[PDB]
Amino acid sequence: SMKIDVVTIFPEYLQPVRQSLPGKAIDAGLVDVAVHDLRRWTHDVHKSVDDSPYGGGPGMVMKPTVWGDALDEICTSETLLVVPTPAGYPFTQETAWQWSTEDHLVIACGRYEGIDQRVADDAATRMRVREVSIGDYVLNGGEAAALVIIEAVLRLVPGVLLEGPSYTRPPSWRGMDVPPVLLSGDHAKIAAWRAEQSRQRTIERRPDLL
Amino acid sequence: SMKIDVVTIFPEYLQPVRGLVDVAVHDLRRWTHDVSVDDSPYGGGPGMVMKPTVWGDALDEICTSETLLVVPTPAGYPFTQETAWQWSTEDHLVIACGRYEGIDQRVADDAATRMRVREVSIGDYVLNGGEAAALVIIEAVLRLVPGVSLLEGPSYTRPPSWRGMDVPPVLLSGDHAKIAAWRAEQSRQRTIERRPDLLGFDSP
Ligand SMILES: Nc1cc(-c2ccc3cc[nH]c3c2)n[nH]1
């Protein structure tokens, strides 16, 4: 039973993932993903969501008054507020598992040079707030990160070393045969072979994990 | 000038991409023949594996020897900002999006005999397929295309006082040197707290 609210100035970005949800989970009321246009909470006829940064610098900062009103309406005491940012704590599988048991996630998607820091700081005085990064690269905004987090979390909600290579038919293709051990019927040996493949791949690609 | 082709069994998922660059999305099922792209794994295991035959045909049509073939996978080399800068100079990226339990390894191995191949992970979490990773890679790369360390500290804008929370006074002081020093300090503090690995310290 999880509800996810996403707030963004580009609601159309999230539309595919909304549609991608299985009806059986939606009908069972096990999951609901709602997307909100941040501009619903703007104060002015120009629907302004950003303003110049204090202390100077490039780009713009999203307005605290707008975000404050949005979160006031959408969040409750039980909300886990997720704020994607390149400066965040790392979002990992452990994080995804933890958040998969939450009743209400709100994902605040920033743009430009991010959201006025007081928004998160204020919210943290009455709900749990998690500023997170999905990887060491910079995006244009939080929307792609939201898609990633939603996918990684929801697939752990029941109802909705590195892995080595996998193979399927045909046994020979473009001069390459499936490793004979996999067709050996020696399942103890197959397990040992897969372990070694995983070890070698981890050494080559992710020595940090060792 | 960059071309990006994405191959997927779920082309509709890639609508979120909304003259220096063209992005094209191809339905993998276009290269099937009889009225299945997946089969059970050799050696056992849960789930299904995408057959190499259909992928080979698709990539034969879409790739050239100059192509950088990108294959999202949880077991990939890390995709980082450095990678994004590197790929931002490429003429042609092809992103092969897996589903099920992944793609038969021979697809990448075969392709690597004709072109450069990069199996990459966008982070240490598991997705349902390569499509979300493709969106992340495309965004991170295209923003670096010509014509298109430490953690950043907090940013602020008007009003200077909000809900009884004040913008740090130094930011209103107009003293460029003091502001630079404060921002550097905030960045160091944030990096130590959130990403100590970036400064060569142990992770929590
Ligand atoms: N891991 C990661 C997060 C982001 C991100 C998140 C929000 C915003 C808002 C403006 N730029 C942003 C970038 N980039 N990379």
Ligand SMILES: Nc1cc(-c2ccc3cc[nH]c3c2)n[nH]1
């Ligand atoms: N970094 C990361 C990549 C993926 C990914 C990529 C392709 C497939 C195909 C089936 N599941 C997949 C997962 N998850 N997390």
